[PDB]
């Protein structure tokens, strides 16, 4: 009763939405390095035995339709559900290629009363996206709730930019995949994500020719409404 049942026939789906190029209606810069993230995540979750589905450059309409359709699948034989969102964002918002959609709208499809074959199962949302435009300068050293069993693993603190490297991928996804590869057979998920927080916080610092964007830091933000411990083994 302390840990989620993870020995269903299937670990579950891993949906990866990878938005790199955006319409001129929004403008918004192409997200160089995000293909590196998407590939890293595909391989990482393949090795965790998830059924990975990669999707590229979805409009906000397409994102909502995809989430709706997936929430209407029969997940009875699956232990869990994972959704990874790679895009531009603002607080509470992820961008389709043609504009913003509320994260709440995406999550709502998987509510305990709306996706019954996932009721009582962990629903993990992993979000690499800005959550605002602040920069961190750093410092020298018989019923269950319908909102239960969600985890939102954010790349960055609320209100803040999130950092992506054009060559290596985003700081958060780099670190997440590295910690999952090293510890998924040894540590509970919250402890893995805590290692990810440390890695991002300690091993990364921005380098920029623009002083305004130089020497900046990042701390990811784990938001858990899980009711049990989650082990991938």
């Amino acid at each position: 009763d302390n840990s989620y049942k993870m020995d269903y026939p299937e670990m579950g789906l891993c949906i990866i939405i990878n938005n790199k190029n955006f319409h001129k209606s929004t403008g918004m810069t192409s997200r160089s390095g995000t293909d590196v993230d998407a590939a890293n995540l595909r391989e990482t979750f393949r090795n965790l035995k998830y059924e990975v589905r990669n999707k590229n450059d979805l409009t906000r309409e397409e994102i909502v339709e995809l989430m709706r359709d997936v929430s209407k699948e029969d997940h009875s034989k699956r232990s869990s559900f994972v959704c990874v969102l790679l895009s531009h964002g603002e607080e509470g918002i992820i961008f389709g290629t043609n504009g913003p959609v509320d994260l709440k709208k995406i999550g709502n499809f998987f509510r305990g009363d709306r996706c019954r074959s996932l009721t009582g199962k962990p629903k993990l949302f992993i979000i690499q996206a800005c959550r605002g435009t602040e920069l961190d300068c750093g410092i020298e050293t018989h019923k269950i709730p319908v909102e239960a069993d969600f985890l939102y693993a954010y790349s960055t603190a609320p209100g803040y930019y999130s950092w992506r490297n054009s060559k290596d991928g985003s700081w958060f996804i780099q670190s997440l995949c590295a910690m999952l590869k090293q510890y998924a057979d040894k540590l509970e998920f919250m402890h893995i994500l805590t290692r990810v927080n440390r890695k991002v916080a300690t091993e990364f610092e921005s380098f920029s020719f623009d002083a305004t964007f130089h020497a900046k830091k990042q701390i990811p933000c784990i938001v858990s409404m899980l009711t049990k411990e989650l082990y991938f083994y």
Partner: peptide, 4 residues
């Protein structure tokens, strides 16, 4: 390094 670029912001998202």
């Amino acid at each position: 390094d670029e912001v998202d």
